[PDB]
Design an enzyme around this catalytic site. Structure first.
Site, PDB file in Angstrom:
ATOM      1  N   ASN A  45       0.854  -1.181   0.000  1.00  0.00           N
ATOM      2  CA  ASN A  45       0.000   0.000   0.000  1.00  0.00           C
ATOM      3  C   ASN A  45       0.890   1.231   0.000  1.00  0.00           C
ATOM      4  O   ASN A  45       1.872   1.286   0.742  1.00  0.00           O
ATOM      5  CB  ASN A  45      -0.905   0.067   1.245  1.00  0.00           C
ATOM      6  CG  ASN A  45      -1.957  -1.011   1.268  1.00  0.00           C
ATOM      7  OD1 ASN A  45      -3.089  -0.813   0.819  1.00  0.00           O
ATOM      8  ND2 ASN A  45      -1.589  -2.170   1.802  1.00  0.00           N
ATOM      9  N   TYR A  85      -8.906  13.473  -1.423  1.00  0.00           N
ATOM     10  CA  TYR A  85      -8.986  12.632  -0.241  1.00  0.00           C
ATOM     11  C   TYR A  85      -9.098  13.533   0.973  1.00  0.00           C
ATOM     12  O   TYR A  85      -8.422  14.563   1.040  1.00  0.00           O
ATOM     13  CB  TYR A  85      -7.725  11.798  -0.106  1.00  0.00           C
ATOM     14  CG  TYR A  85      -7.617  11.061   1.201  1.00  0.00           C
ATOM     15  CD1 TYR A  85      -8.174   9.803   1.333  1.00  0.00           C
ATOM     16  CD2 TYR A  85      -6.972  11.621   2.304  1.00  0.00           C
ATOM     17  CE1 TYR A  85      -8.093   9.103   2.518  1.00  0.00           C
ATOM     18  CE2 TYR A  85      -6.893  10.924   3.508  1.00  0.00           C
ATOM     19  CZ  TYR A  85      -7.446   9.668   3.604  1.00  0.00           C
ATOM     20  OH  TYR A  85      -7.365   8.975   4.795  1.00  0.00           O
ATOM     21  N   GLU A  94     -14.152   9.389   6.271  1.00  0.00           N
ATOM     22  CA  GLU A  94     -13.062   9.450   5.305  1.00  0.00           C
ATOM     23  C   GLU A  94     -13.696   9.572   3.927  1.00  0.00           C
ATOM     24  O   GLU A  94     -14.527   8.733   3.552  1.00  0.00           O
ATOM     25  CB  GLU A  94     -12.200   8.192   5.413  1.00  0.00           C
ATOM     26  CG  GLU A  94     -10.940   8.182   4.589  1.00  0.00           C
ATOM     27  CD  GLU A  94     -10.175   6.884   4.761  1.00  0.00           C
ATOM     28  OE1 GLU A  94     -10.820   5.822   4.848  1.00  0.00           O
ATOM     29  OE2 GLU A  94      -8.930   6.909   4.828  1.00  0.00           O
ATOM     30  N   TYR A  96     -13.630  10.545  -0.431  1.00  0.00           N
ATOM     31  CA  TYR A  96     -12.899  10.348  -1.670  1.00  0.00           C
ATOM     32  C   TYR A  96     -13.713  10.890  -2.839  1.00  0.00           C
ATOM     33  O   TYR A  96     -14.898  10.561  -2.977  1.00  0.00           O
ATOM     34  CB  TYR A  96     -12.649   8.872  -1.935  1.00  0.00           C
ATOM     35  CG  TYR A  96     -11.914   8.088  -0.872  1.00  0.00           C
ATOM     36  CD1 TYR A  96     -12.555   7.693   0.297  1.00  0.00           C
ATOM     37  CD2 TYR A  96     -10.579   7.713  -1.052  1.00  0.00           C
ATOM     38  CE1 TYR A  96     -11.892   6.958   1.251  1.00  0.00           C
ATOM     39  CE2 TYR A  96      -9.923   6.957  -0.112  1.00  0.00           C
ATOM     40  CZ  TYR A  96     -10.579   6.598   1.048  1.00  0.00           C
ATOM     41  OH  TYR A  96      -9.912   5.858   2.004  1.00  0.00           O
ATOM     42  N   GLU A 184      -2.938   6.969  -4.817  1.00  0.00           N
ATOM     43  CA  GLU A 184      -2.838   5.719  -4.086  1.00  0.00           C
ATOM     44  C   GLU A 184      -2.304   4.642  -5.015  1.00  0.00           C
ATOM     45  O   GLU A 184      -2.618   4.632  -6.204  1.00  0.00           O
ATOM     46  CB  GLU A 184      -4.216   5.282  -3.572  1.00  0.00           C
ATOM     47  CG  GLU A 184      -4.233   4.032  -2.695  1.00  0.00           C
ATOM     48  CD  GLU A 184      -4.481   2.723  -3.447  1.00  0.00           C
ATOM     49  OE1 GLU A 184      -4.513   2.712  -4.703  1.00  0.00           O
ATOM     50  OE2 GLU A 184      -4.683   1.693  -2.752  1.00  0.00           O
TER      51      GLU A 184
END
Length: 202
Positions: A45, A85, A94, A96, A184
């Site tokens: 990640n 983000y 959270e 996006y 990401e």
């Protein structure tokens, strides 16, 4: 001008930046203002972002309009996404706003609906993350997603307009904590040069 290879947070020219990965190779070139270029490979990640924290406890109406005028030279070779983000508090969400992706279009599942913002159609999704890391420690929080139906890698993202549309779909908006232009990567390699990233507030 400055290249980072390891996990780091900091500021440049008023923008909060972060490079993070759990493992693998990452390079983030801090290029001034909101701009940054990144490369990853052999990662599990990773993330690369520049944006701003707002402080205090203010709603999107109190802060004023939040927009990103951006351009990205975007070349993922596997799983990846390119998005605004951020987080809200009270409640903890959270969020996006995804404009492009690599091999997999996030977040999966079925959308609540569709909205139209900045000339594009976005599928809207809401999920729950249980006992996961967050800006307020390991806890449970919602995720909100707007995901463009077709990829693009430059234009304006009017964050406030997504907030308003989410509200109309019944998704509660609390105080805005931060927003950033974000790359990401997952189990992949790639490059992404965020050569333009003008965040405007109010």
């Amino acid at each position: 001008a400055t290249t980072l290879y390891e996990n780091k947070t900091g500021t440049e020219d008023g923008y909060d930046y972060e490079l993070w990965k759990d493992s693998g190779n990452t390079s983030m070139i801090l290029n001034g203002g909101g701009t940054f270029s990144c490369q990853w490979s052999n990662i599990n990640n990773c993330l690369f972002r520049k944006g701003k924290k707002f402080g205090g406890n203010q709603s999107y109406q109190q802060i004023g309009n939040i927009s990103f005028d951006y351009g990205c030279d975007y070349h993922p070779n596997g799983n990846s996404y390119l998005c605004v983000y951020g987080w809200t508090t009270s409640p903890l969400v959270e969020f996006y706003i995804v404009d492009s992706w690599g091999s997999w279009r996030p977040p999966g599942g079925s959308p609540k609906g569709q909205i139209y913002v900045d000339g594009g159609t976005y599928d809207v999704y809401e999920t729950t993350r249980v006992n996961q890391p967050s800006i307020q420690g390991n806890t449970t929080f919602q995720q909100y997603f707007s995901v463009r139906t077709e990829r693009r890698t430059s234009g304006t993202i009017n964050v406030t307009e997504h907030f308003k549309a989410w509200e109309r779909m019944g998704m509660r908006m609390g105080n805005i904590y931060e927003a950033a232009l974000n790359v990401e990567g997952y189990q992949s390699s790639g490059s992404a040069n965020v050569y333009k990233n003008n965040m405007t507030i109010g």
